[PDB]
Design a binder for this molecule. Sequence first.
Ligand SMILES: [Zn+2]
Length: 617
Amino acid sequence: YTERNLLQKAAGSEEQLKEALVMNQKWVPYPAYNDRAGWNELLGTNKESLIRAGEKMLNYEWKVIRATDYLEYERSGERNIMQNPYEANRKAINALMLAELAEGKGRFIDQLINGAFYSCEMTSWVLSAHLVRQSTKRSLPDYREQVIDLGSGNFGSMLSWVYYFFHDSFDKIDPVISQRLRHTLQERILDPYMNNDREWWMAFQWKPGMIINNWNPWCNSNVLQCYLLLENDRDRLAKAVWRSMQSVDKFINFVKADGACEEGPSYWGHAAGKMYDYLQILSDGTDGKVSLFKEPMIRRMGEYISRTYVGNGWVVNFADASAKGGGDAPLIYRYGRAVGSEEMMQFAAYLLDGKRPSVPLGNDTFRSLQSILWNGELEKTTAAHTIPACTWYPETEFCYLTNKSGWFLATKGGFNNESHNHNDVGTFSLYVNTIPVLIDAGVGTYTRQTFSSERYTIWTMQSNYHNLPMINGVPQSFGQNYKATDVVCQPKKRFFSANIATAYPKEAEVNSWTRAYSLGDKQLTITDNFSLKSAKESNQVNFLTWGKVDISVPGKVTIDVQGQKVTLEYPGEFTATVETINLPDTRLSNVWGTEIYRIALKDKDARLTGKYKFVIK
Ligand SMILES: [Zn+2]
């Protein structure tokens, strides 16, 4: 945590903010509903696909979300029973809105009215799992209280746009529709935001040890759209926009300055990506007077999604994250354009893989509309993903290294209480021509143990199944104070090392253990350099991999995967075995196939001090 307060410094004060604010929704960057020519020019060939999406919803049947659909969360923790009809309802509305903007003949208005009307009858827009933050802590929506969550924020931003575009059309049919929708938005977004200081995601009660995360910018971004679209009293608007700036500053203050996403690439789009959206929304709402887009840290927070991307759908997957990824190109484009990152824009074009971008349907109206606005520029942008020799994130302690023969090495220092922590201090992952060769297993299906204190009985979470030693046969231990020390990165030598001794418990009986990586033009060198207090058990050095693994030759492990070969050479003191790891969990088997392997290298004798050297070529 660092007291940057970038937003508050950029605006100066509420009073200065109030003068910057753009009233009467003149900041809106889309064409008027009645500007058919404008919508045609902007949509191009997307027009037709949006209209056919609306035709599907012409006969959409609104679903009651049952009381028992909420009660289930309490009974059993099941959430899909509630989420599935809720999302269907919400997506129907968003697609009817996009279809009506594209066609503009009033043919979707009746169902828009139905969706708005139904939406005002629903007790709550909040997800069943998030309703336990009511006073009473019940999962059943309590008509006497309001809460704001991820779900209700999106639902509010969508209905605010529905109001903005269509209130005049609704009024021709019956003024009560608009009138009530406006009153509902006031009751469910606008008032609770201002009147309740204690929502955890707002972080006005934050103290060291408490989390701030994606919720903060995500919730705030939605709140801000609602205020900019509905609040036509300048004093009330400035007060609310100022509070959102103070809240989001909490998130910007908490993040690491090197710009790495600790949640990882799978979460980037809703963490730094929703911050970006919040900042777009605030910029447009202040005629660009309030902007952080020239700030390097905001740029680096964006480029992380480029640097973690290895190729052909593989991403760096430290912690409990998927090895597969390849994010929202339209999003990545817009972030890149805003911060002047050519890297980000080229990469968005690269993710399209020679295909035309699409307007997303989904439940995020801001992103649907912004994809309509900027997709045409994305479609013309020249594609590339040029990955530098070294990327070094010194606070987060991620290091990505690359050579000209198509090798990508990811390594980390860090600590064993990271987001979605794995016990993996000093681990590496190696890819050759985008093919994973020494691998990090990543995310499995959630069970009762996952978020319990039996978590580290799950093999994917254990240093045992990462590319690490078991020192005196002991793995790393969970905890904030199990960390790398003496962390070094020398970009010019493609070098990283960390004293990983301090990520092991006392039972490891280790004084120091330096794990070091040196990527040459055609090889990787790994070294382990250690002093133990007692030589109790043979050290065991483990490598995770897949494909065909051949340990027949002593001193050498050949790995063949998808026509890529590497050879791992190890010292004579070790004996090699290869253990099969079957993958019943399809969340893993969909990624790696039905089985992967652990290469176990067990030192023939215990030693007090020693140096192991591994070469992969
Ligand atoms: Zn892992």
